[PDB]
Each structure stands twice: as structure tokens, then as C-alpha cells.
């Protein structure tokens, strides 16, 4: 919650790109799940919303973006749907993780990428 860094479109090169080691990006939008291209098929009902980020951060740094208020960021990296966890290692991308997961599976993804 207090470890969350809210970002903007022009403030992406300063916050996440140029950083110390590992930096993640939770591409949320409060419509936890839903797609991009046709904003006609989406879902606000579902309840797998994962706020687990205020917990694994406490266990590196993780950022946080909203594409309804930042439609400039997602199109650059070809994010065709959320939530997509893009891992920024040295101002680049190591691995991506589409379709939400529990705390045991988010550990499985990280621990096969940091050390």
C-alpha cells in the first residue's frame, strides 16, 4: 500500500526504467481481469482481484499503473490485456505473466527470475 508507486505516461523513464536491479509493473485498472481491443467484453463482477502486492513487496520494488487514466503506456509494450505483470530488469523486460495467480504462484514466477 505504502510501497506502491503510482506512475504516469511521461514519468515511466524516470520511475521504473532507470532503477536499481529488479522492478515490476502491475497493470491494473480496477476492472480486475478485462481486455483492451474491444472494450465491449469486460467484467467488473469477478473477485479474484489480487491485491497481494502489498504483501510480496514486504517479503525488490513493485510499481502500479492504471490504463483508463494512462492510455499511452500500455500500447508501447503491446499489452493486449490486463492484468499483465511486466518485469523490468535493467530497463528491459525479462518475462511476462498473463492471467492472475495466487501468492504461491506469484512466488514461483519471481523466484525463477531474480535468483
Amino acid at each position, epitope marked *: 500500500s505504502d510501497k506502491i508507486i503510482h506512475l504516469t505516461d511521461d514519468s515511466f523513464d524516470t520511475d521504473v526504467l532507470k532503477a536499481d536491479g529488479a522492478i515490476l509493473v502491475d497493470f491494473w485498472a480496477e476492472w480486475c481481469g478485462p481486455i483492451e481491443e474491444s472494450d465491449d467484453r469486460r467484467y467488473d463482477l469477478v*473477485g*479474484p482481484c489480487k491485491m497481494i502486492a502489498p504483501i510480496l513487496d514486504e517479503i525488490l520494488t513493485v510499481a502500479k499503473l492504471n490504463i483508463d487514466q494512462n492510455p499511452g503506456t500500455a500500447p508501447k509494450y503491446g499489452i*493486449r490485456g490486463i492484468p499483465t505483470l511486466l518485469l523490468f530488469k535493467n530497463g528491459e523486460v525479462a518475462a511476462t505473466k498473463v492471467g*492472475a495467480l495466487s501468492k504461491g504462484q506469484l512466488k514461483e514466477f519471481l523466484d525463477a527470475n531474480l535468483a
Partner: antibody
Amino acid sequence: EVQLQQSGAELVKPGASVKLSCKASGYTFTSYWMHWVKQRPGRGLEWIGRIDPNGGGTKYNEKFKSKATLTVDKPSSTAYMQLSSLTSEDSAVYYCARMWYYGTYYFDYWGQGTTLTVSS
Amino acid sequence: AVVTQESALTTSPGETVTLTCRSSTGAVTTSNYANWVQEKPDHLFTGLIGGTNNRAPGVPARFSGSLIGNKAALTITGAQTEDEAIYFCALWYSNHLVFGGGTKLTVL
């Protein structure tokens, strides 16, 4: 409007290969995964694999890793599945299901199926 | 792993039936993402539930998903005559799906 239609009733020899198609329409093809299932009499269902049409990433059942080969064609919206080294065990009605993966995993739209008969 | 279901259950119009979906490894959790496909006569498949409780678009609200004890479940509150179908389930283990034998629901 969403529809999944697969190829017609095939007849193939043992030892050969076969390619089953799955035309997808009424939606953006590259926004949903595409599973494939095997239905034999008295065996229920059997997962073969899935494919993300955005990137062509694949995951398989351990039993069907050497058997199946899932690919896609973005222009024609057609998903694919190539069964190789066909035997009498491969004689089954193969469907293609759609999956919403964003936030959770649920099926929704299935095809009518394609009856494959491996006869010599 | 081996997913298990009831062979066949019986119910009537208006009644509340409950199907189950055991796992051989242990208990069914939120990690398993319990799915529930429906097979009406003449091979008409359609996904009802997935991720333990989240319905698909257009699926009747009576089909609800839960976790009763050590197994996933599918409660049909107010069973219709059209519901007469084979209800398979499907649990995830290490990114691989495992279907069950199916449950022949018969509505009088």
C-alpha cells in the same frame, strides 16, 4: 455471435498425420486462449493442450506432448492441432474450447466437434 | 492426479441438487480454479463456472460455485428440465488440466 466451427468427419490411415482446424468468429481471435479436448466413448474428456493466439505460446498434457502440435493463424482466425503417428487410440471427437484467462480461468464457448476415425 | 465425481444423481423440478469434485492429491483450493462444463444431448458443450465461482457471460445465475469441505461444488438452485446434462469438472495442477468422469444429472 461467438462461434467455433471445426473441419468435417475425417478418415485417415494409421501411421499418417492429420490437421484439424477450428474457425473462430464473432470476436477478436488474439484475445482468448484455445484449448483442445478428446472425447472417446466411456472415457469422458481428456485435455490435450492450450494455445495463446497472441505469441503462439503452448502448454500440453504429458500424455499428448509427442502427439499434438498446437499452432494458430491470426489472419484467418483458425486454431490448429496436428495429431501425428495415428493409432486406434486416437479415434475420437476432438473439440476446441475458448478460455477467458484475464483474472480467472473459465470456459465458455465450445465447438460441435470433429469425428476422427483411424481406419486401415 | 485423478479428479473424481459422482456417477449419476437424481433430482426434480424446483429442487436444489449439489454436485462435487474431489481431488486425489489432497483438498481442492483456490489454486486449482475449479471449472464446470455442461454437456447437453447431441454433444452441446458450454462452460458454466471457472475459477471456483466465476460464471461465464450469459450463464444462468442459479449455477453457483463454492468449496464445500475438501472438494469443489456446483449447486443448481431451482433445477430446470433443460439442465438434464453431464456436468464435468476440471482442476489445474502445474498448468495442466485434469477432467473428471462426469455426473449424469437426471431431472424428472
